[PDB]
């Protein structure tokens, strides 16, 4: 009970490219000539996200020496990180000819294995990052400057300047979006572009060196990055996040000129972006933010005795739930008693939360028991004259259908519970054709992204058949699913509809 | 009981190459004019894994702030690295010539001592390693600029760019399988091929110098890394693991070319693949996963008390068995009383598990005995009004019988428990001839790669003579043997049959 | 008694390289011319060798986490490492002339101190060394490359590669023969041969130079390896250990050219290899390995009362004896009896080990005394109704006579006790004319190295004389003795018998 | 009572080289014509030893981790290092010419500061050093290669092997003697012979230059070094020890060519050796090696009350004495007695050791008294029905009187105890005329070393006068003196009589 309190749950993250969605182009003029071929074997994405929501101080303490608010790490660490992305196990390649003369579209590597980490809203605040700031590290510079006397007469007079400068393969470059949000971006600083790669200047032999190649480019990367939060001591709400494990999927070029054979890499190899979004909505009144771990008031009339409460005020003494955070109350340095589900509001013995004395049932002096400023028959239990309800975890994730990007806005379910698509040929906009939303456990919303342009919610096979969205008119095909209600979330950007929310227990 | 639980045991891996498996070509085009020679000597393989299941949380404390989940350690650390993989206790070689018009096979070193660790399915998740991804070190860069004031008039501006990087001779290069395995590949980087093992460049002397042929190539290299996965919290099932202690044996080559005599090295050497497999089958039901070390229920009746329990709810008074995970019980921090063996269910004092009131027979405070929310008559003992059971270690390993490749599947023992063996002079496939499944307690598997492609079973000795299996179509004749049933595994790939494992106790 | 139990004993090493044996040639080609001189003096070898029997986990306790094994610590470290070899307090030497035509045969130095620590058969395994593998330190390369823009126009593109890495004089190569053995060699890199230790390349000195002949290869160099065993964990036998303090004794060569005056090392200099070899039989049934610190049974009726019991099962109460293992018992944590002797089997108050409960006379709550789940009168002190017994440490150890190779098998002595010398003018084999085994409490094994070749027991002298041995064609007689039956050993390699061990007591 | 017993005293070291011992030749080849002149003024040799007999080990625990032996140190550490060697406090000199044809008899410097540590026997071992063996660093190379592309055309390809390793002025170089013997020399590596403080190659100027004459040479040096020595757990007997604390005097030289004026030094310097020899001899009986404190066995009776016992066997109460180790017992933790003076027996209460059990009277549970399995009237004391006696402290040392070389041998004295010298105008032998053995407390041995050769008591003034040697025939004269019997000890080490050893109390 002395302890800072959490919710710590990993966010499993997978997501694999087919080789649908790999095939690139062979060549940048010769694209048509030289075919389509995949440029990532086997690739799939794990990163195993620790994202916990927590607090920054205790409660009920004078001498307020940290600053209260509330902190939200999303965040990879040391004992979390996942497999990791790969594209390639290998560098794998093939040689092209004209139909610049020569092409490798060597298996893609990534230029950054970007994150962004959005928050529509400003009901909270961004405090700090793992990175602190843009690390910057201690130059240092040299100036040498000399004669010679020499006698054969020889004066001569040299000056050189020194610079030295800690690089990185895969440095950090911390971009902050917001108030409320901040994307980190690993570009290539060390062997950057398909230039950069190259082995020689002035025979035919495979020109992309695999040592400067790193592992962490096409065999494996994982993530690691802290973002913490904050916001108001009283803040209550519901912000949606965008947790996004993304990456920069391309293909190495480098060809040759008619000249000396010199292999110059392209600067506009086109970097195809491949994401997977995580989402998870927030509710500011958790009972993570208590500070004090609950403790119960024990009922010693029947077996499951637990106190059972709603918000009109009235006690029954009722059966016990684990995730139930009306059936224990936390305990204050007040001396009062607060329920474990909300300490906006307390228990009040005489009501909106005070500085009141007759609150107060303290434990007995000695052994476990409560004393007064609980006599009851077992036919009744009322108030008259210890165990932990572990809210402290969350539910179950909810993936989302689509894609993420644009404004969003939550939309509210029609009292005839009726999902309306006003698309056609061509997707509009949706809201809440009529679907009904009860029995169905299983949602299939093949999908992907529209021909006529950008990442839509194309369709959604409703079986139970609702075939709500267009087919015929589709690009590379990302397909989800989602096994199973309270209400309906939306992520249409301007006039596309592309994410999609199903909030249940 | 306030440490973390764990299963920890040494996996033995024993394999050795024999001449007949060694046995390579001693040249590149002149393989039949130069004969054939043994390249390893004395080539045994020990490399002692240090495998061990477990979790990384404890069990009913609120305030969760490291993720719930299973975490399965596949690894080699400090107190653990067996003798090490083998070649050749030195560098023997044997000079031949033209009938490059040089060779010199010397005695086989490795490119790499690769790593798979593989799991089939998606009950589990992998969550980080030991190398921790793959290790970038920070580099630096030198730029230096100067111009001379020379009176004799001499006036040169120079500039010249440094870069400095820390390589290793046995780097670690980790590649990621999926969200369930990866794979650890220590390719050479520092003296590298044959042709970075080149000591000059333009007499006839033995041009493959020792002193960069490391003692970490050809002598002994002992592995060092770690896995470890992530599941659900409430996850049931069962993964066939693949733990590889794998090399990549390889004649050394060097030639001379009719120019100067250079000693070019052969990149397309060829690097044969012999490997030594291990798999262990997990119950992600097993007592590891509990949290709290068990304690029994003691009886003062007879001798031998503790309670052994079946499924069906009823309690009987009988012996006492170290493994039997159903004598003894967990203590929770609800007060509780949750069974050693299945702590996914709980007693009941009322069935399923919920947070009831009357589960419980607390302790005497005070001295060691057990009071009420054992009163019974010597000639019951059932119910009316401490000891460890250590599950926590696992059993006998079953060695595997041929190689494991291609899918994976868990054939069901037919109600005859004959085995069946669909193969003739060209093995096609196999399943549960008619072979009896008793009397026999040692199998004698002797196989190895058939003459027609691939590694297979190639024939199943059953002596009692069962000789299901030809042998006049054999190649490399790896042979096993398992000595001693519950049922029968098997690991064919496409068409072609290799694998069996025989669960047994 | 919550400490790990060990069985710690130095293993005293003496051996003195007598002018006899470390006479070599004086020359190359002109051994003969030469003559012949010693070059080592004073040459003894004293290295303290820290041989300890121990394990690698407690005893009792749930929640294993290092994996259950017998770990055999054969090793030198801080604390011991004895005076050292050595060959010559100083660089001795003498010049020679044509009868190369120079020779400088200086005061030998040694190529490596090999050790080699070998197990025969597969008991048990070997888990891991100190030199933790082969050690691999991180290299480092650099890269410079630039242009100048010179006006007098000079423009030269210079680009150089560097290479570091930590080089030692005497470094480690670490060998693993088996599953159970491993070797260290200390080749010579740094100053490697008589090559290397040349001063000038193009007047008659002294052309060795004492500052690059090290004081660690002439005056004293100390052992410091460990090597540390497995096996199972109810592992039981027997294996013949082979500790070797062994060097590589060699006279400096050097030589001059008939050209410039150009002094040439020797690669093929003759480099004579002397030993001293330990043996100590281990059985893996000891009290070492149980994990808990015997504690005794006090009896109060007579003066020497401690249960010396055999293996029938009856309890006689008789004198204490300090190495006499059945005479104090361990305390488990299943809370029975245990004998100190044997905690494969165990106390059974009903027999084999079972978690039986009547096994229990637990201790007083509160004073120390004996309780029931002992009372006897003094006529008899039978069951009716704390002190140790060191067995943790080793007896004294008996030296080998003659040598130790070739394969080993433990003879078994006749009915009549007999030694038999089946060899005549050429030794071909012995076992168990015939000897007498008693009346003799010193050995006398005159022997050395047969004329006919290998090295063998030619001689066997057994004083009361029974000469069991020729003496005219025996080469340098390393002769050694040994004081005082069980058994006999023998260590035959293919047709010529070396070696010999008597265990007593 | 929980702490390592030793026994800790200095050993006081001094001897001061008096200018007739100092004068040595001016010159090579003049040293008739350059004179005799001293060349170290006030040098006096100060080296307070810290030699400590000590054990590595506690006595009555089960678990023996470190072996059990004896470990003798005869050592210099950071507390005590006395004022250090000295030959003069300035490098005097005085320039000679020819009557090279220059000198400079600079005062003198030491090559070593050579340390001999020797046991005659082989009742003990050695077990390890302070320098742990001979200390070698890591070293490291460089290799740069790099080709120049000019256009003014030019290409160079050059190559260039570098070598770093850390020198020392005075390095340390460790040579051991035997299993119970090492030797230090601190040759010089730095700076080492009058040809390397050389300052300039090609005006009359002093040309040896006093920088890179490091105060460490001239001014002060003090000894840095330990032994740790090693034996059997049960030895027994005496060895006499030689502590040296040795240098090696010189005068640097240096001289002039007849080409430039070249300044070459000598490398056939003479090095005068002097010492001065330390020797204690040891009995392994000592107590303090029993591993427990000594606690006594309280009389009430008397004033003087402590038991002093003999090897009757009889007890007798009788005064207490501080070093008489008969008057106060070990306690083991057997529970028995064990006297202070004789842990190789014990008491016994029936003896020979063994493991009995009425060996004890334990001390009273609660306050201090003892009990049994002391009642006796006043006038007798005798058994029937705590402090220390430090004796872990030695006695005062006896110095040596002559030197100590060759082999040593224990004279038994005569029955008259007549010392009987059996020399004449040239030493032969000595032996136990006819000399008194009593009546004189200080012996005046005025000695040297004799002019027919070597070093010898070549006279022995007993002063009541029994002179017994000659005085016509010596060489420099280094006299001693002995203040005060119980045996004689001598050191003739073939045919000349040069130690003696007089113990006494």
Redesign the interface.
């Known amino acids: 009970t002395n302890?800072?309190?959490?919710?710590?749950?990993?966010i499993?993250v997978?997501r694999a490219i087919s080789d649908e969605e790999c095939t690139f182009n062979n060549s940048w003029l010769w694209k048509n000539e030289k075919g389509s071929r995949p440029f990532c074997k086997?690739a799939?994405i794990?990163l195993?996200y620790?994202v916990?929501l927590?607090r920054s101080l205790q409660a009920g303490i004078v001498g307020s020496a940290t600053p209260d608010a509330k902190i939200v790490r999303i965040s990879l660490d040391?004992?979390?990180?996942?497999?990791?992305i790969?594209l390639n196990?290998q560098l794998g390649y093939r040689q092209f000819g004209a139909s610049y003369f020569r092409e490798w579209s060597t298996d893609a590597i990534a230029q950054d294995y970007r994150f962004v980490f959005n928050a529509s809203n400003n009901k909270a605040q961004i405090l700090k990052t793992f990175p602190v700031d843009n690390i910057n590290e201690k130059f240092e510079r040299k100036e040498?400057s000399g004669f010679e006397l020499g006698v054969t007469?020889?004066?001569?007079?040299?000056?050189?300047?020194?610079?030295?400068?800690?690089?990185?393969?895969?440095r950090i470059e911390r971009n902050a979006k917001n108030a409320q949000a901040v994307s980190f971006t690993w570009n290539r600083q060390?062997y950057a572009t398909a230039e950069s790669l190259l082995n020689r200047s002035t025979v035919n032999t495979y020109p992309v060196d695999v040592?400067r190649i790193?592992?962490?480019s096409y065999?494996?990367?994982?993530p690691?990055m802290d973002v913490i939060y904050k916001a108001s001591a009283t803040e209550t709400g519901s912000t949606d996040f965008i947790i996004d494990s993304s990456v920069n999927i391309r293909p190495i070029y480098n060809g040759a000129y008619k000249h000396h054979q010199f292999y110059h890499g392209f600067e506009d190899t086109p970097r195809r972006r491949i994401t997977k979004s995580a989402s998870f909505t927030v509710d500011w009144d958790h009972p993570v933010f208590t500070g004090g771990?609950?403790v119960n008031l024990q009922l010693a009339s029947f077996?499951?005795?637990?106190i059972q409460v709603d918000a009109q005020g009235r006690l029954a003494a009722n059966?016990?739930?684990?995730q139930q955070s009306a059936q224990s109350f936390i305990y204050d340095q007040l001396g009062r008693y607060v329920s474990a589900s909300n300490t906006k509001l307390c228990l009040d013995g005489e009501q909106p939360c005070n500085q009141n004395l007759t609150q107060r049932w303290e434990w007995r002096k000695g052994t476990d028991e409560l004393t007064n400023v609980l006599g009851h028959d077992k036919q009744t239990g009322e108030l008259g004259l210890t165990?932990?309800?572990?809210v402290?975890?969350a539910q179950e994730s909810s993936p989302i259908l689509g894609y993420t990007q644009g404004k969003m806005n939550q939309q509210r379910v029609g009292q005839d519970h009726r999902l309306y698509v006003r698309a056609g040929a061509a997707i509009d906009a949706l809201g809440s054709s009529s679907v009904d939303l009860s029995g169905v456990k299983s949602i299939t919303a093949t999908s992907g992204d529209f021909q006529y342009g950008g990442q839509q919610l194309v369709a959604l096979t409703f079986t139970y058949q609702q075939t709500v969205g267009s087919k015929a008119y589709v690009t590379n095909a990302h397909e989800d699913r989602f096994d199973l209600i309270t209400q309906l979330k939306i992520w249409s950007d301007d006039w596309l509809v592309k994410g999609v929310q199903f909030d249940l227990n």
Do not use: M
Request: aromatic fraction near 12%; charged fraction near 20%.
């Open positions: 302890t800072l309190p959490h919710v710590a749950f990993y499993s997978n086997d799939n794990s195993i620790r916990n927590e040391d004992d979390s990180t996942g497999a990791g790969h196990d040498v007469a020889r004066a001569s007079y040299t000056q050189s300047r020194w610079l030295t400068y800690n690089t990185q393969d895969y060390q040592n790193s592992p962490l065999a494996s990367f994982v690691k771990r609950p077996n499951n005795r637990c059966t016990c739930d684990s165990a932990y309800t572990d402290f975890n």
